[PDB]
């Protein structure tokens, strides 16, 4: 379904498998992420990956319950959610690392790309 991007309907305790697609391995050099928008705030960070595969970091919310992955031809990355909340309701954005002027974490170093994913929890 959706509206401006796509919609993603799941109860607490869920899971889902967001995933992004670019052609022709657009994002094999690059660093990749997921950020989020929960309505009001921010945009925050929530996850990021390596070209190499390798080196995953989390938000400290998102920590221990989300993995991110990667295939190797640069074309996906997938965002694997586990143990939704109602806190976790936001609109999901994948997002190429183009600039370099902070950590990995930052959100500012960070391009949304393609279209976003709004996940609503339904406690």
């Known amino acids: 379904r959706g509206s401006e991007f796509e919609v993603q309907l799941v109860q607490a305790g869920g899971s889902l498998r967001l995933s992004c697609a670019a052609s022709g391995g657009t994002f094999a050099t690059s660093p990749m992420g997921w950020l989020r928008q929960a309505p009001g705030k921010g945009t925050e960070f929530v996850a990021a990956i390596s070209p190499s595969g390798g080196d995953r970091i989390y938000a400290d919310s998102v920590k221990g319950r989300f993995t991110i992955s990667r295939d190797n031809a640069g074309n996906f990355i997938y965002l694997q959610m586990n143990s939704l909340k109602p806190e976790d309701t936001a609109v999901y954005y994948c997002?190429?690392?183009?600039?370099?002027?902070?950590?990995?974490?930052?959100?500012?170093?960070?391009?949304?790309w393609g279209q976003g994913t709004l996940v609503t929890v339904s406690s």
């Open positions: 997002a190429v690392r183009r600039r370099f002027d902070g950590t990995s974490y930052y959100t500012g170093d960070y391009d949304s």
